């Protein structure tokens, strides 16, 4: 799974263990090995949400599966709870987009996931 | 809707009201409330387009609906016109990608849009 | 085609000709004109992959076609080989996501690709 977190919170306010916690949250929620999770953090970013500059996190999550409607409720709940705790964000300032990719459309280790299976 | 604008124009040359104008443009074009629009601006970025470093904007727009082929022509026209005016970009230096998401695949306020409906 | 490369390698370690080489690689692999390829490089980024901070590249590639399963193996191989050479990355530290867009969902030159055809 590949995650991008963009936030207007300053990078020094995003704790150094945030990525590791998010890795662990999504490994459990998505049933995926920690070894195949990437987290990108773009903090101190220029973001407007709902017309204001209040702290916000805009998150994108890509995965091969584990993205049924029901799964995505669980992910939303878990990711949001982490952001509440670690980023001091209200739930209405955590936006997540979910992309379910075919293994034919993910490259890793020099070939697609589909070709390595 | 969630928008990411990456540009090699310096951040001080992207006017402070750009995001608000883009918010308003897309609220009208997409028939969506301003309260549910996020704009991320990554300016001063390292971009090459068509082999050159000339000023350019690469934009991604995600939305739940409002992305028929006809809708996306209108969005392109409107977004491009804003970038022409505010970013001093020719139209051939404004590239936009449109992603139409299921409400099952957007999290907001601690659950999916689908679960909140 | 539109490419985003995020890496935790420092920007001064990403050679200035990286984007041009990647442009050329994908023009050949995807059979697309150099004039319609954008490369965004977000270097010096905060990334965790597999729980560690080792150098890594997380890449997103969008295209109108040229993204059959077989095509994406070739792209993965070629892009990975470039990153091995230019970024000093092992193949298991190059992750790529492939998005195949409709021409109705790409704006360029003030209208969609579909409307310009």
Number of domains comprising chain A:
1
Q: Do A69 and B110 touch (CB under 8 A)?
A: no
Q: How far is A115 from chain B (nearest CA, A)?
A: 26
Nearest-CA residue of chain B relative to A7?
A: B40
Q: Write the CB contacts of B69 (distance below 8 Å, at least 6 apart in sequence).
A: C102, C104, C112, C114, C115
CB neighbourhood size of B68 (10 A): 11
State how far the Cα of A77 lies from the Cα of B107, in Å rounded to an integer.
8
Technique behind the model: X-ray
| Best of C108, C113, C116 to mutate (most B CBs within 10 Å, chain B) | C108
In a domain, A112, yes or no: no
Does the beta-carbon distance from B114 to A69 stay under 8 Å?
yes
Structure tokens, B73:
């022509």
3-state helix, strand, coil in chain C (%, to 5): 40, 30, 30
CB pairs under 8 A between A and B: 99
Whether the CB-CB separation of B71 and B106 falls below 8 Å is answered with no
Q: How far apart are CA B97 and CA C107, in angstroms?
A: 6
Resolution (A): 1.6
Contact C77, A74 (CB under 8 A): no
Size of interface A-C (CB pairs under 8 A): 99
Q: Residue C110's Cα: distance from chain center in Å?
A: 24
Q: In what order do the strands lie in the sheet with C57-63?
A: A111-112, A106-108, C94-100, C57-63, C2-7, C38-42, B46-49
Residue C71: count of CB within 10 angstroms of its CB: 19
Contacts of residue A63, defined as CB under 8 A and 6 or more positions apart, other chains included, come to A1, A2, A30, A32, A98, A99, A100, A101
Among positive and negative, which fits the CA dihedral B63, A72, A74, A34? negative
Asked whether the beta carbons of C77 and A109 are under 8 A apart, the reply is no
Provide the sign of the torsion angle of the four alpha carbons A108, A110, A111, A116, taken in this order.
Answer: negative
- Residue among A50, A56, A97 whose CB faces B34 most closely: A50
CA max distance for chain A: 46
Q: Do B72 and C110 touch (CB under 8 A)?
A: no
Task: Using the structure block, give the residue that is written with the tokens 């709902």.
Answer: A50
Q: How far is it, in rounded angstroms, from Cα C27 to Cα B4?
A: 25
User: Has residue A45 been placed in a domain?
Assistant: yes
Residues of B in contact with C114 (CB under 8 A): 69
Give the chain C residue whose CA is nearest to the CA of A27: C50
d(CA B50, CA B56): 10
Per the CB < 8 A criterion, the answer to whether B10 and B49 are in contact is: no
CA dist., res. C75 & res. B35, Å (int)? 40
- Residues of C within 8 A of B98 (CB-CB) are 101, 104-107
Domain range enclosing B20: 2-116
Query: Using CA atoms, how far apart are residues C50 and A39, in angstroms rounded to an integer?
Result: 9
The CA distance from C41 to the nearest CA of chain B, in Å, is 5
Question: What element of type H or E holds B115?
Answer: helix B113-116
Q: What is the CATH number of the domain that holds A38?
A: 3.30.429.10
CA A110 to chain centre: 24
In chain C, which residues touch B (CB < 8 A)?
Answer: 2, 4, 11, 14, 19-20, 23, 34-43, 62, 99, 101-102, 104-112, 114-115
- For residues A17 and C56, give the distance between their C-alpha atoms in angstroms, rounded to a whole number: 18
Distance CA C21, CA A1 (A): 27
Does the CA dihedral B98-C108-B78-B59 come out positive or negative? positive
Across-strand partners of A57?
A7, A94
H-run or E-run covering A30: helix A18-30
Please name the chains neighbouring A, where neighbouring means 3+ C-beta pairs under 8 angstroms: B, C
Compute the distance between CA of residue B32 and CA of residue B2 in angstroms, rounded to an integer. Answer: 11
The answer to whether A72 contacts B112, with C-beta atoms less than 8 Å apart, is yes
A19/A16 Cα distance (integer angstroms): 7
Q: Is residue A68 part of a domain?
A: yes
Beta-carbon separation of A107 and C79 below 8 A: yes
Instruction: Give yes or no for a contact between A91 and A57, defined as CB atoms under 8 angstroms apart.
Output: no
Distances (CA, A) of C115 to A83, B93, C1: 41, 17, 17
């Amino acid at each position: 799974p590949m995650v991008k977190v963009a936030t207007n919170i300053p990078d020094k306010d995003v704790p150094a263990n945030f990525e590791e916690r998010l890795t662990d949250v999504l490994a459990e929620s998505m049933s995926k090995p920690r070894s195949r999770i990437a987290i990108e953090v773009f903090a101190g970013a220029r973001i407007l949400h709902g017309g204001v500059r209040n702290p916000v996190a805009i998150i994108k999550i890509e995965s091969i599966g584990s993205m049924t409607p029901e799964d995505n409720i669980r992910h939303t709940q878990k990711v949001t709870q982490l952001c509440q705790q670690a980023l001091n964000l209200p739930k209405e300032k955590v936006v997540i987009s979910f992309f379910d990719l075919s293994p034919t459309n993910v490259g890793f280790g020099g070939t697609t996931v589909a070709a390595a299976t």
